[PDB]
Design a protein around this ligand. Structure first.
Ligand code: HEC
Length: 81
């Protein structure tokens, strides 16, 4: 949930419903709706960073996020659709 997202600074660069710096969380949700192991995939983007899927500004690695927290954030975002 978004208390986790706040602690881990996700919810400045992102918003649920609309693009800020990073894409809207509900857009991530809809894009990967049918990706399998989408949650592992998104925890991995969250921990190690992302480049070029949504724009030319990359997401740096979120090095202080735990695996469990990255997985919980990814699961939460997936439920957003
Ligand atoms: C807090 C720890 C988080 C979480 C859970 C996520 N982010 Fe970001 N993010 C940012 C940008 C510019 C992008 C697009 C990057 C690109 O074009 O490749 C993203 C992308 C994501 C994704 C999508 C990954 C994918 O493969 O589609 C996800 C799941 C995600 N974020 C979650 C920008 C930022 C930030 C600005 C500095 C910060 C801080 C975060 N994101 C933090 C988080």
């Amino acid at each position: 949930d978004a208390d986790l997202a706040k602690k881990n600074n996700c919810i400045a660069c992102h918003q649920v419903e609309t693009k800020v710096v990073g894409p809207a969380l509900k857009d991530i949700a809809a894009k990967y709706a049918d990706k399998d192991d989408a949650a592992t995939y998104l925890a991995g983007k969250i921990k190690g960073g992302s480049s070029g899927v949504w724009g030319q500004i990359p997401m740096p690695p979120n090095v202080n996020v735990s695996d469990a927290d990255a997985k919980a954030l990814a699961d939460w975002i997936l439920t957003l659709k």
